Amino acid sequence: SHMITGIARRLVQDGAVEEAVARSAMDQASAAKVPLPQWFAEKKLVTASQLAAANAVEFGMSLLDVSAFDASQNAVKLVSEELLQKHQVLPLFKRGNRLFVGVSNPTQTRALDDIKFHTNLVVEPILVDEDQIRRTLEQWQASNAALGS
Amino acid sequence: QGILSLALKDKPALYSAYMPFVKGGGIFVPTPKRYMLGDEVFLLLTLPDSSERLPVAGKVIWTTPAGAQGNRAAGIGVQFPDGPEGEAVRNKIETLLAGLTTSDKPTHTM
């Protein structure tokens, strides 16, 4: 018929956005041929954190509050500043041969491929909302910079 | 909602649950209940060394949903509070994990 779907359905279930707005976003994204998560990100119909929460349940991805992450354990130096600018990801943490990378977009995969071929680590995506990525990256870069040049 | 509970039988179980990268320490609690980051939660935690149940008034800093890609358990990562009660819990966990600290084994989180 016209069931509200995907991310829009979850944002409605989470109370983040609201039936008529979600239905409109779904239909307008389809009319514009824009993927729904990108549509919501661009149209700013909800907060970045509300969108991340919806993306996490809809795409089955884990979600982290990086403001609670211990900056001294960040893995930012493992990834070139070039890759960081190109993709808008936040390298989180390395354990064994794995590098966990924070992403705000659940479907970006070429970024993960570029990071894997750059680091030769196993790359695992974790959702981090878009505001947290931009702010935390520069905080962690200041922390890392204190270690020297 | 109510009181979450987590019982950890042995050091491998504790290793999988512990979140050393969280400020003040954190612990992964499997649960199908859906939480939002920043939710305050109350946890009753049993560690492998005794049957004592340790109260943890924590904050949700991590979620893994039902049906996650791969073989990830659904649940929440709970940040320990910064006072002496939370510090005591974190302290007991890292001493119980003595020798497990440098392991490369995957965990429930990172």
Numbering used by the authors:
A (entry chain A): 9 to 157
B (entry chain C): 8 to 117
The authors write:
Type IV pili (T4P) are thin and flexible filaments found on the surface of a wide range of Gram-negative bacteria that undergo cycles of extension and retraction and participate in a variety of important functions related to lifestyle, defense and pathogenesis. T4P filaments are produced by the polymerization of pilin subunits in a process that depends on PilB, a hexameric ATPase associated with the bacterial inner membrane, while pilus retraction is powered by another hexameric ATPase, PilT.
Native and selenomethionine PilB12-163-PilZ complexes were crystallized as described in Materials and Methods, in space group P21. Initial phases were estimated by single wavelength anomalous dispersion. The asymmetric unit contains two copies of the PilB12-163-PilZ complex (chains AC and chains BD) and the overall structure of the heterodimeric complex is shown in Fig 1G and 1H. Structural alignment of the two PilB12-163 fragments (chains A and B) and the two PilZ molecules (chains C and D) show that they are very similar with a root mean square deviation (RMSD) of 0.6 Å and 0.4 Å for Cα atoms, respectively. No electron density was observed for the last 6 residues of PilB12-163 and the first 8 residues of PilZ. PilB12-163 is made up of two sub-domains, a four helix ND0 (α1-α4) and an α/β ND1 (a β1-β3 antiparallel β-sheet surrounded by three helices (α5-α7) and a string of three consecutive short 310 helices (η1-η3)). The ND0 and ND1 sub-domains are topologically similar to the MshEN_N and MshEN_C domains, respectively, of the V. cholerae T4P ATPase MshE. It is noteworthy that X. citri PilB sub-domain ND0 lacks the specific amino acid sequence motifs required for c-di-GMP binding found in the MshEN_N domain. Specifically, in the PilB12-163-PilZ complex, the carboxylate group of the C-terminal Met117 residue of PilZ makes a salt bridge with highly conserved Arg103 of PilB while the Met117 side chain fits into a hydrophobic pocket made up of PilB residues Leu72, Phe77, Leu100, Phe101, Phe108 and Ile134 and conserved PilZ residues Phe28 and Trp69. The NMR spectrum of X. citri PilB12-163 indicates that it is at least partially disordered on its own and becomes fully folded upon interaction with PilZ.
